[PDB]
Each structure stands twice: as C-alpha cells, then as structure tokens.
Amino acid sequence: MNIRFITRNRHKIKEINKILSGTGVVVLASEHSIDEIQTENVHALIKDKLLKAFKLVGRPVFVEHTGLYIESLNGFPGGLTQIFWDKLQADKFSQLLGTSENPRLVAKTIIGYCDSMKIYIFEGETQGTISPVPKGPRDFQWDCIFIPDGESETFAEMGDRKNEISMRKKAFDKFKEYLLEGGK
Amino acid sequence: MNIRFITRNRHKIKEINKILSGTGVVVLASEHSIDEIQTENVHALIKDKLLKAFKLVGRPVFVEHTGLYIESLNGFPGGLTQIFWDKLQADKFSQLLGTSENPRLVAKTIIGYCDSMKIYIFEGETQGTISPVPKGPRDFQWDCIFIPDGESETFAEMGDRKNEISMRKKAFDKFKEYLLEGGK
Amino acid sequence: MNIRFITRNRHKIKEINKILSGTGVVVLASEHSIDEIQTENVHALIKDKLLKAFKLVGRPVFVEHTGLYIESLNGFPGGLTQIFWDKLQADKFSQLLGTSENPRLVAKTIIGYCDSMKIYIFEGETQGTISPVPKGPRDFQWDCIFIPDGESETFAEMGDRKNEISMRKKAFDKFKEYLLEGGK
Amino acid sequence: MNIRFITRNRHKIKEINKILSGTGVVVLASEHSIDEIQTENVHALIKDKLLKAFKLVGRPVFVEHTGLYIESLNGFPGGLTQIFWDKLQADKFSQLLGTSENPRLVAKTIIGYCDSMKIYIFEGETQGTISPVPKGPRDFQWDCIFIPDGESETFAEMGDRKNEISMRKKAFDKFKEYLLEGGK
Amino acid sequence: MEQLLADYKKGNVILFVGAGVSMNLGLPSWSQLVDHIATELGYDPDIYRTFGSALELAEYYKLKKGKIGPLRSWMDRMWHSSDIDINKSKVHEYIAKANFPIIYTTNYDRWIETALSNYGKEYIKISSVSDIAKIDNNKTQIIKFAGDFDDDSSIVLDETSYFQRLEFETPLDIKFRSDVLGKSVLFIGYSLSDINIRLLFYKLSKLWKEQKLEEAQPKSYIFLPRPNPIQEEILEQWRIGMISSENDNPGESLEEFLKNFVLV
Amino acid sequence: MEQLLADYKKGNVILFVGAGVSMNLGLPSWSQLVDHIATELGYDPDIYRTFGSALELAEYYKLKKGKIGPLRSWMDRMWHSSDIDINKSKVHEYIAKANFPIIYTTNYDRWIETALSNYGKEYIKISSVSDIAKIDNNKTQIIKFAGDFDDDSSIVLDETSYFQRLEFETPLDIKFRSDVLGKSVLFIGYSLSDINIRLLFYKLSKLWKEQKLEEAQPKSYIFLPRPNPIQEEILEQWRIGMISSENDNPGESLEEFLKNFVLV
Amino acid sequence: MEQLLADYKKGNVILFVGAGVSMNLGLPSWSQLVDHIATELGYDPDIYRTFGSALELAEYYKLKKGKIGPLRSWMDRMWHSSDIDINKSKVHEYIAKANFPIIYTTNYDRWIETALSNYGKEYIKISSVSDIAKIDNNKTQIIKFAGDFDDDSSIVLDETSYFQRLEFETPLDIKFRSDVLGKSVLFIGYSLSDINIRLLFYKLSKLWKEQKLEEAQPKSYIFLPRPNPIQEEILEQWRIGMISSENDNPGESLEEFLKNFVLV
Amino acid sequence: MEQLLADYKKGNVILFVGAGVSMNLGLPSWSQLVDHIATELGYDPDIYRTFGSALELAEYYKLKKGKIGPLRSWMDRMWHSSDIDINKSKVHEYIAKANFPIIYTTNYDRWIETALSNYGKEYIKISSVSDIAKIDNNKTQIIKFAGDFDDDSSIVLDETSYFQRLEFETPLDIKFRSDVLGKSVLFIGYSLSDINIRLLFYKLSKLWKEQKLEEAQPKSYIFLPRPNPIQEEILEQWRIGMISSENDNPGESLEEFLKNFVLV
C-alpha cells in the first residue's frame, strides 16, 4: 500500500519509517507544517487536519497527532502540545511540573487516515511520569522528559526499543491491522 | 456608523457597548464562537478570525482577540489564552504564577476590522502584574487576577473605571478615532 | 355526369343541349372564343384548343371544332372554316363553289375531351353536296348551303331532324357512349 | 448591328440577305416554322409570332409575315396566305381569281421586331393585279401570279429589280431606317 | 371539415387572410403592379416578365431607382382610393361578424380594420414590438405579418427581404411560433405557390412527434377554391387539410364558406 | 423600486420563484440532498463534494444506479411530507393574495398551487404542450420551467439536462420568449449562480436594441438579500435592476418586500 | 474574368458542377423524368405538369408508390447505360485535365469520376462522414452535395428533402461552409432556379461584412450562356460575377470557356 | 491509451494546448492577475475574490476603467518579459519536435510559435478569417481560439465575451467544427472547469448517433495529471477518455507523456 504522510516534524518521519519497516506498506512523507485548530476534542482536530492534508494531496494520505495530557494541569495539552514544547523546552518543564504533587501524565497519539473515500481514526495511549531532571539525548523533543509507567528510563534513553511499547506503536499497530485487513 | 461584532463572550458585548456609549457608533453583536488558530503572530490569527467573521456576516464587521503574555512563561499565552483560562481557572493561576520570581505580564487586545473592502488592525497593551490571590468578583474571567501598573487593585474590584486605562480602551480609542475620521 | 363546354357559337350550345337531352349528362357552357391555330392535322388543333380550355377551366371540360372539306378546293377548310364563312358569307359561296364541276364536300366535327387526367378524341363525318343557292333560314351559318347525302333539302330547312344523321350527332353519339360506359 | 430572323421560307432568307447588302446590318437566319394564329388584325398575329420567336431565341430578333389581300375575296388572305398557297398552288389561283370581274389585290408584309426590350412594328403595301395565267419561274411561290401596279411583268420574270418597288422593300427600308438612326 | 367547425365554437382557431380577399373590393393586383414597374423602367409589360419571378422583378426596380419609397407611395395612394366602398363586400362583413380573437394577415392595405370598425368592433394593430405591449384580452388582434405602408423597413416586397424573414428571428415571429402551440389555423384568400407555410408547418409538426404526442396537435385547414389532386397529398404530411368547393365563381364560393361561421 | 410598483397594477410583471422561497417552509436543501447521494454511495459527505459541482454530483448517482427514479422517489416523499403546514408561511400567503397573472418557477414541488388553493384561488398547471391548450384568460397560470415529479423525461436534475435546455428549443421556452416581449420579470428567491438568467436576458435585450427602441424594453428586477458591489454592474449591462435590504434575517427580509404588493 | 484567372493560378477556385454539363453526353433529361412519372400513373405528360413544380411532381410518385426505390432504379440503369461514350465529350475531358483541387456537384450520376480515371488521374469520393476521414492532400476530392444512387436516405429528390437540407446541419454542409472561408467558387452548368445558391452566399457575404473585411471576401462567378439584365444586379449583391458569351450553341459555348483553364 | 498512440502514427490527432503548459516557463498565473485588478481597483486581494468567479471579476475591471486596454498592456509586457528563456522548457521542446499537423490553443501569449521557430520549424498563425486564406499544406497551423494581444475586439477575457462565443458563429468556430469531423483531439494543459468542451463534444457526438455510424467517431483524450473518480464517468458519455499518471510532480508527469510522441 502506497500511503502519503504530511507533517512538520522530521524525526516523526524516521520513527514512522522504522516502525513500518518490512511491513509491505510504504510511506511517501512530505513536509508542509499544517496548522492545527484550538479545540478540545482531538477527533475534530484530526478531521480538519486530514481535510487540509487531503486538500493538499488528493491521494490516500494519513495524518498523525501526538499530545501530552498532564494530570496535574487538569489535562491541559494534547492538541496544543507543540506550542507548549516550543515555548518551554526541557528547561522550564521539569522544574515546575516534575516536582509537584502529581507527576502522572498520559501521552496519546491519534492517527487520521483518508482512503480518498472516508476518514478513519486510530488512537493509542501510554501512561507515564514527568522526570524531575531531563535525561538522555535531546534531539526528539519531550523524549528526554518522559519516563513510562513501570520504567526508570526516559524514552530518549531507552533508544530503539521505544518503538515497541510507545503509543505510536499501538496506534500504528491498529493502523497496520486496518491496512492489511482491507478497505473495510 | 453601523458596525457588527462576532464573539462568544457575552461580557465582551457589555464592555464594548459601554465603552462606545456616546461616540456615535453602535455595534450589533452576535454570538457564534469562531474557533481561532494556533500561531505565534496575532496578525495572521486576527486575519483568519476576521475572514471567518466576514464570511459569516458579509457586511462591515470587526472582531477582537484578547491575549495575556506572562514574562515568566516567556510570553506563552496570547492567541491561546481562552483554553488556558477555561482549563486551569483562577485556582491554578495564582498559586504557581503569582508566587513566581518574575510576576510581570502584559495584556494585549488586537482588533481586526473589515469595512467590506480592506482589513484594518488596531491594538493596545498594558503592562501589569499577576496577583498571588484571586481578589474581586469572578464573573469576567481573569480581571480578578490582573494587577495593572501603578495600582494595587485588580480589574474586577476597580469597577467601571476598568475601561479607562485598559488596553481594550486604548485599542478601541484608536478604532473609534479611525471610525470618526472616516475610511482612511 | 357534369362536363363543361367552351365555345363562341351560341347555337352550338343549343344543339349540344338538345342532342344531349335525356342521356343523363348535362353541359355547363361558357362563351370565351378561344383562338385556334392554323395547321393541317385537326388532332394537334383540337389538342391545343382543349389545352387552352383546360387552362381556362381546370375541371373536366370538352371542346369541339367543326370543319367543312370541299373536294373542289382540295379540302382547303377544316380547322379554318370560321374565318372563311365569316368573311365570304352565303353570297360568295354558292355562286363559285355550288356551280363547280365537282360539288362534293364532307363535313367533320372533332371533339376534344379532357377528364382532367387524359385527352380523348371523338370524330364524325358526313359526305354531302354544296347547293347552288342558299336555301333555308340563315341563322346557323352554312346549314342553308349543305345538302346531305341522300336528300335534297338543306340542313336549315330540314329542321329538328338535322341532328339525327349529322356528323355532330355521330361524334356526340361516340362521346355519349364513352361517357355512359365510363372512364375507359 | 446584329439581328436574328426566324422563318420557314429559305428564299425569304435569300431576299432579306440581298436587300440588306451593304446597309451595315447582318441577319443570322434560322429555320423553325413558327405556327401563326388565325386572327383578323395582323398586329396581334405578328405580336404572337414575335413572342414565340423571342421565347425561342432570347436575343434581338425580328420576324416577318407576308399577306395577300384579294379584293374579289373581300380581303380574305393576309395572316393566312401560307395554307392557301400551299393548298391550291398556282393552277387553282389564276383560273378562278385572275378571270374575275375585280382582279385588284394588295400585298402587304408586316415586320415584328424585338430589341429585347420593346416590340416595334413596320409595314409596307403594294397595290397590284392577279394574272390570268402563271407566268415566270415558280420557285418563290406567288411571284409568278402577281402583276404590280404600273407594269405588265410578274414579280418572278422581273428579276433582281423585284425588291426595289416591292412592299417588302418598303417595309425593310423603314426597318433599316430605324436600325440606322438607332433605338428610338 | 366538420372538425373545424367544432373548434370554431370552443375558441381555438386562428385566421390567416391573404390577397384573394382583396378582389371584391376591386383593388389593383400584382398583374397591374408588375405591369407598372415595367412601363416605368422602360420595358414592355410582357418582355419584362420573361426575366424573373415577381419578387425579383421588384427588387430590380428598387435597386435602379434607389429605394422602395417611390413604389410604396403609388401602392398606398392607389389601393386606398376613394372609389372603393367597403359596405359592398360581403366577404368582409362575415369576417367582421364572426368570432376570431386573433387575425394574422399578409396584405399591406388597411381594409380589414376599416371593416371591423364599420360594423362596430374594436381592435389592436400590431406591427411592432411596442404594440405587443398594449394587447387587451377584450379586443381582437390584427397582426400585419408582412409590414404596412407606415414604414419602409418592414414591408416585405423583395427577395432579400423574403429571405431574412425565413429564419424566424424577428420579434413578430416568436409571437406566432407560440400562438400555434395549442391552436389551429384557417388559411383563406391564399395561394399554394408560396413556401413560408411549408416551413412553418413542416416545423410545427416535427415538434409534436418529438414529444410523441402528435395525436394532440391541433388541426389546420386551407380552403382553396378549385380542387387539385397532387397537392392534397403533400399538404397532409405536414398536417394541413383542404376544403374545396364546386361553384366556379371563386368569389362566390368564398362568401359561402364564411357563412358557417357568422352564424349569429 | 418605485417603477416596479407602477406596473404591479397594470399586470405586466411576471414572477419567477426559486428555491429560497421554499426552504423557509422547512424543506430540505441541496445540502441534505447532495449528502444523501454520498451516504448511498459509500462516500463521506465532505469528501464527495471535493469532486464536482452539485449537478455533477447527481449526474453521477444516476449513472451508477442507472436511472433517476430511485432519487425522485426520495425527494417527492420527503418534501411533500405531512409535517409541513402551509398556513404558517407568510411568504406563501402574500404570494397567494397578490395579483400576478403569470407565475414561473424552477422548484419541483407543489406548494405554490397548494397555497393558492388554500386561500381560495384558481390556476392551471402547465408542464407540457397539452396544457398550453387549456389556458383560461380568467385564471392564473403556474408554469414549471424545470419539470415536476410527475414525469422523469423532463426533470432538469443533471448536467446533460441543464444542457439540451440551453438552446431554448423546448415548447415551454418558446412560450417564455414571447411573454417577456412586452412585460417585465421580478425574480425572487433566486441565487445568482446560474447562467440561464444570463443568457435569456442577455439575449432579449440585444433584440430591442436592433429594433432601435431600447428605451422601451420593459424594466426587470431581482431582490437579493445582501448586496454585492461587483455583481450589480454586470447585471445592468444586460438589463436587470437589483433591489435589497438591511434586515439581516433572510426570511424577515423577503416577507416585507412583499407586503408592498399584497395591499388591496 | 481576368480576375478569376488570377486565382486559378494560385489555387483559390472551387468548381461546382450541375446538370447542364450532363446533357452533352446524351443522358436523359429532367423532362423525360417527369414524363415517366406521368405515364406510370395514368396521367398524360402535359396535364400532369399543371399541378405542381417538378420536385413536387416527384414527391407524389413516391407517396403513392410508398418509396423512392422504384425510381432510383430506372434512373440508375438508364443514365449509366452502355451506349454512352465518355471519350466523346470535350467538356468532360477538359475538366479532367485542369487543376481544380476540390469539386462539388449536384448531379447523381458517376461520370465525372469515370472521366478523371479514363484520362488517368486519382481522386476520392465523399458522400458521407466516413469518407471525410480518408482525405489525402495529394488527390482530388469529388463531393456529392445531393446524394448518389448508392443510398436512398440521402438522395435529395423531393420537396421535403430539398427543404430540411436548407438549414445546413448535415455533416457535408459544415464542410462547404469552411471551404468557402478563404476561396472562391466557379459555378458552371447551373441555372438560376434555386435558393440554395442564394442563401448560401447571401449568408457568407454578410459574415465578411461583420468582420469588417468585405474588401477581402473573394469572387465567385457563374458562366451562364445567354445574358439577363435583371439577374446580374440581384446577383451582384453577393459577390457573384457573371460571364456570358455570344455563341448561341450552348455546348459550343461551354467548351471554349474551359480551354482557358486547361492550357497545359 | 494505446489507441491514441495508434493515431499519432497515421496522422489523425489534434493538439489543444491550455494554460497548464505555461508553468515551467514561470509566467504569471491567473492568481497574480486577479491580485492586480484588486490592488488597482482599491480592494484587498482576498476580499475581492468573494463576489464572483473570474470572468466576472475581470469584467468589473473593464466596466470600471472603461475598456480592456489598460490590462492587455500589463499582461503583454509582463508575460513576454526578457527573463524567460524558452530553451529550458522540456515540455515545449517535445511539442516542437513531435508531428502534430494542426495545433489549437486558448492561451494569449506567443511562446508556442517562438518554440517552433527556435528548434527550426515553420508555421502559419491564424487569428482571423484573412489568414484562413494563406494556409499551406506544408507547414503547421497554429490557431488562437481565444484571441491574441494584437487586437482587443477579440481577446475573450470577460463574461459577456465568454458568452457570445458559445453559439459558435464566428469564422474560427466554423473551421473547428469541420476539422473534428474525422479526427481525435488530445487536450493537454487544460482543467476540467470549462463548458466549452462539453458543448463542442456533447454536440459532435450526437451527430454520429443521428447518422448512427457512432462506431466511426474518432476517439478523444484528456491527460489530467491528478486522477478523479467521478469525472471519468461523465466524460465517457461523450467519447473523451482520461489518461492520468502517478508522479505527483505535475510538471514532470506532463513532460513524460510527451515522450511517447517525440519518439524520433
């Protein structure tokens, strides 16, 4: 299956490429930096972002969105995580969220896919914790700040075994299950 | 002069009615809740919001976006203040931003006005301080948390003289000035 | 049967009325004085005269031409008898043709009939002798000069039995026969 | 000037050729034998004959009709002279009209000329006497029977000076005069 | 025939008067007309005819002289002389007494209206688009399909003219190609040697057949004084029906046919 | 505007109603219509739109399902439902109580007639040549310019139909193009996104000018609700005069624009 | 005349042949045709020709006999007989030697092609659209504007037909109306008794005038044999010349006019 | 698809180039155009694009300024600037090296001929009825179907213009409706949002079917870079077949397709 991908993140392309490596499907990724909308439900956000991507391409194209949901911050980001990270980085994140009463937070990836006829929504989630100190490499955003539940290593520090339990892996497992199950 | 206004805040209608009492112009406000976009520049944001308002009305209509800019948060809100205040309210604002080492913040409103031919942009700003405690009535969002420069009372407790030094008053003074001199 | 007749002789109308009394057919005579042509054959003459009569009427119409043929004149009249009799009358006929060595002459009528589809030709003849003196009434042209074969009275003095042995009676007997058997 | 002529007499062509030698005009004669009409006035006769000649040619064409008028016959020929001469010839002319008490007769030709716009009529006449015996050659019809006024020789024996006093010469002198002065 | 009288009663017949009617009056006629041009141009009455139809002969005069004006002036002053009395034409009386709500015509004169007035009736004369705007459903309409003597740019008196007026694009055609949708026409005073009729009807017919509702197309007619075999056949394909007579007096025959309509 | 009011009493205004008048009643709209086709075809409402106009997104349904029957059934049953009350629509009331002699429409329903009957009037529906043959000058004429649901050979609901119908050769065309000569049309309910109105008037006008009487061509109109600068100049080149209002409630607007006619 | 010769040099002349050419050969005339129809119907020659034109007196045949087959057969067998020798007709020789790139005709026979082959030349026949698809720019094109005997749905031999073929919607028309946009036509063999020749040019000329380049539209011609005052004027109105002669012999006349073109 | 290549071989295909081709060059686009009209007239780029399509927005400019001249000048001087080098557009190279006998276009610029000359070739430009008289069967013909910048009375750049040019009555229309009789057209650089191609083809087709020789109609094509489901359905109704690609670089896709033709 030849599916296209529109995104802004370049490392997202390499993650989706090594996750889907050897499956049979291929991804023709392109960089456009589609702006998102400020809504609470991620279904409408992934719907209109996939609408803008299909208006850009016109071929079968899927669209990914990733969000952090901080339980201390009453579930504030998720949909709006990009501006949060791009204004704070890892310096002004862990000193005021990792040292609070509730370090618990959940990270969700939602995939919106268009088969040129319909819109299909697939999602996955992992629970986790904010580290009090940023730890590991700092080349893939909040990977050095996010320890998963039941682990003591940040997602940048585990390395290539991040893509076996992460929320991108479950979301693209459901996407892979749909893509080889047929066009149902 | 007859100009229209699209918003979702019912008290924005009240303040723009009572600022513009006696200047000559009147506003015919309607409630629609246009969804804004997530960008850094407020010019493209107010252009997109005024474009949606003009597509909905089709007559001379202005729209207004109001933003806080907290210096301890490196100016994180502004464009995106509504989801912030609607999520963490007044309880989870003063206890972790009013107690900060840098309590400086500036409040800005931008006004996008369309005369059905062109797009005109007017703005105002007021430097201020975040209170360590919500003080005043809580019927008009963050007026009970904003200490203006030169005073010790919040905008909620200050009363009807709130819209004499406010950034909304400066922006609407420039808007009223352009409406009274004419279509320049 | 209703057939029309075009002529210039008013007594031709009278004779054709009183020959055809009781046979079933009637004639609607009109006076026009069609000008004949000068030819030797009476077939082309009666075809031209019937053509002019059919162009004038447009309905089933018959026409009739009557000719004398004097043997001392090598059969000079016939086709052209009308101008002859209208010029030299009865005075300059008997004194130089009735006194001739050969007083034989034959009288013929030809009848051209058009049924608005075809042209039908009927004829009769009677051998006779020219009188040396006009004898009888002079109201019907040369009947007072024609001695028929077998008698010594002219056609004028003979009376209403003129049209029982006459060549007009034989030609109209053939015409009446074809009109009663039908469109053969 | 180039004028055409339609006739049936081949010697009419010869005489009109040799009368019109040297005047300037020439004739292109053709033989068709137009059938004339049986009327008293020669004007309607020559109009009908010129109409048939112009319908056959379509160019400037003249036609000519030649008539005898015997005073003992009350002017019976003229218009109808051709059938008369072709039937009784020269044998049955002199023995019963040349021996009459009144041997006066006048010969006339009428010329109907069409210039493809109008109809022009020219005529001539010569008083004369009928011979009691055919005298002269018999190649040109009744020239051997016509004694002109003032002479004792027939037109046949007179020779080439026949067309100097003849009625054809007077009529063609008027025709030649109108052709030389022009289209009056 | 009977069918026609059926329609006359309901109110679904249109009348198309032609030049034949103008005989009783004693007006001139084309013969005299063309004879006229001939004398004027220098020819002879008969020699002129040998060259063309009739419209063509007239388009010559025009070109020679320069324009139609001169002739229109003769026709108008002559055809409308003061020696013609309308009261003595029975044909007109009947037309003015029957009940036809729309009367079309191809004459250029003005007698049909003069008649309608003399026996007390009202009408609206339509020779242009301006008039199509005054029509009242309470008066009779008289349409001059071939022009009148009150304009020179309408009178159809020549080939070039009898041409353009063949694509039916004039304002006064569109009105007639929409008045026959749902109605029958009764030609009178006409002749069968003109083929506008054959393109009008040959074209109304084909339309019903497209819808395939042909059975409904109203039915036309065409009283001709003298009967003719061949033509009846052809004028039937196009959907028109003849109604001849036997009186050889053409005029008399016409006065007759129009009594089955005046019937008080 | 005043000029219009002048004629609404002479009987020279023709009303051309369109979908906007309906909607208010509570009926569906192409929104729902085009969506239905989508679901019935496996597509998603939005995605389907990104492919063609709307007519096109219906030339397609048919082609797949072979014919237009399946759809005409849904529309007929859904629109003419029994949860719709006519006495609750003023727009439809004022229209019934005015005095317009002829009424053309491009809607497929049957609500206008229903109203005229409800408030006590009489009319003759015209959707084929047969009807044209029944017109009574004493009742109203309601012409369906785009077909009704009582036939499928004449329903303009697709491209290939908004085509052979751009040559104005159908019988119902010939009628319009004879009615507009001498009268003016007041368009209402319409949205200017259709070029049928721009090839009719563009073609009528150019006719008057050839006739050299432009100053006579009757005046038209077109009540739009919100005004457009650009599309007001273009629509004068031809010859239509826009009218408009300030009340922003669409329905409110239309209703009052009409009381200016109902009085009396 | 001289002007014409100019164009023939380059290649801007088209030839249009008619029946006059096919009479020198010996073929039956049209007279005999109509007469035949008469005998075969009980009428007599003369009386039959008093009811209609000629085309009309041939639509009657068919109608009675139900179809045109019975005639096409007499005609085909009689004309294309074997007592006719093509090498004895100069007119047909020259035509085969000249240099005319395109040749239209209104005859139904096949003698022109026969000659072109007898004197060694190549050509293509076009009587339908399929043929148009085979045109070679290196051979002559012989177009049959009025049908051949190899099909009866085309032969134009009756009124009804010589009618519907006056709207120019047939494929073979569209071609002639694009061939004459840029070239001139030399009519020969014809006789002014048509309106096709008149509504063709009358309609081309007017086009050039709108284009405001009248001075460019080329010049047809029309060798007639005898001359006509009137027609020259009427036909002068639409760029049609005229080139009569003086030799009365019709055949003689035509042949000479042609040698002016063969000239090796 | 293979069928098309079948014909380039024999010699029966016509190229109809559109605006898409003019992209590699770097010319302005339609967008920039309307942006200009907007700034000039006093509006804002986007606010302007809300009141109409394009053949409306431009007609406004013209109605306002007074005439089209002021724009033609900007366009001509801008589109033909000296910063564009033809030698660097592969698309043009292929077009100039292929062997298409007749090339039609809807662009207004002059680059297609500049190309033919630069790679050594010959041509005749036809924008008027005068040039149709110079055509030589040994050079390529280039027809400007929508006008050039060498006249303002032709350039079709506004509604009213894109109107009259839909009855196909101009000289250049009569020439195209006789060039497709027997030929397939290969559209390129076009976009499916114009109904000229749906009236020409929806009308060429009906003819074959009327003759019933349908099978004969040559076959068209329309390479569209991106593919669409619905359109294929409709465009098949009138023999037109799509030929999409997969390369998402539209430009590249186009250059490709034109190699199957250049093939020495």
Ligand SMILES: NC(=O)c1ccc[n+]([C@@H]2O[C@H](COP(=O)([O-])OP(=O)(O)OC[C@H]3O[C@@H](n4cnc5c(N)ncnc54)[C@H](O)[C@@H]3O)[C@@H](O)[C@H]2O)c1
């Ligand atoms: N109610 C609806 O939404 C709807 C939609 C489709 C059909 N209809 C019927 O049609 C009417 C409404 O149609 P609509 O206004 O919704 O149509 P639309 O909005 O679907 O029209 C699309 C656009 O295509 C245009 N157009 C026409 N020819 C074109 C061409 N050659 N090039 C480019 N554009 C062209 C017009 O500018 C029009 O704006 C009603 O009368 C109804 O009966 C209803």
Ligand SMILES: NC(=O)c1ccc[n+]([C@@H]2O[C@H](COP(=O)([O-])OP(=O)(O)OC[C@H]3O[C@@H](n4cnc5c(N)ncnc54)[C@H](O)[C@@H]3O)[C@@H](O)[C@H]2O)c1
């Ligand atoms: N092969 C032949 O001999 C022959 C002869 C007759 C017809 N045709 C066909 O017809 C054409 C040639 O015809 P043609 O020139 O021999 O004459 P034609 O048979 O076409 O003549 C018809 C006559 O009708 C007349 N007419 C036209 N409009 C009229 C009107 N409104 N009222 C009365 N009369 C009117 C014309 O002026 C002409 O005299 C060619 O297309 C040919 O195929 C062939």
Ligand SMILES: O=c1nc[nH]c2c1ncn2[C@H]1C[C@H](O)[C@@H](COP(=O)(O)OP(=O)(O)OP(=O)(O)O)O1
């Ligand atoms: O596995 C991850 N590990 C660490 N950080 C991550 C991850 N995945 C997303 N992120 C960050 C980057 C991204 O910018 C932001 C929100 O995601 P997001 O806004 O959708 O990415 P983007 O804007 O760069 O590309 P796109 O145009 O598809 O939205 O969270």
Ligand SMILES: O=c1nc[nH]c2c1ncn2[C@H]1C[C@H](O)[C@@H](COP(=O)(O)OP(=O)(O)OP(=O)(O)O)O1
């Ligand atoms: O004078 C104010 N004093 C206190 N709080 C205020 C004030 N004015 C706006 N607010 C709140 C509500 C508003 O939602 C948010 C930011 O304003 P802002 O983001 O522009 O409003 P919004 O997103 O809901 O849409 P809109 O501008 O059309 O009303 O802070």
Ligand SMILES: O=c1nc[nH]c2c1ncn2[C@H]1C[C@H](O)[C@@H](COP(=O)(O)OP(=O)(O)OP(=O)(O)O)O1
């Ligand atoms: O029974 C008759 N007994 C004595 N004389 C007769 C008779 N019938 C005719 N005639 C006279 C008059 C007629 O004019 C002339 C030759 O007859 P004829 O030449 O055919 O008459 P015509 O030339 O005046 O024309 P039409 O036949 O139409 O009456 O002898």
Ligand SMILES: O=c1nc[nH]c2c1ncn2[C@H]1C[C@H](O)[C@@H](COP(=O)(O)OP(=O)(O)OP(=O)(O)O)O1
């Ligand atoms: O100079 C003449 N000397 C003696 N006889 C003449 C002469 N000229 C004519 N003739 C004879 C023949 C001619 O046929 C008849 C009356 O002349 P006429 O009736 O006009 O001749 P026609 O009927 O045969 O026809 P056309 O005049 O066209 O030749 O007397």
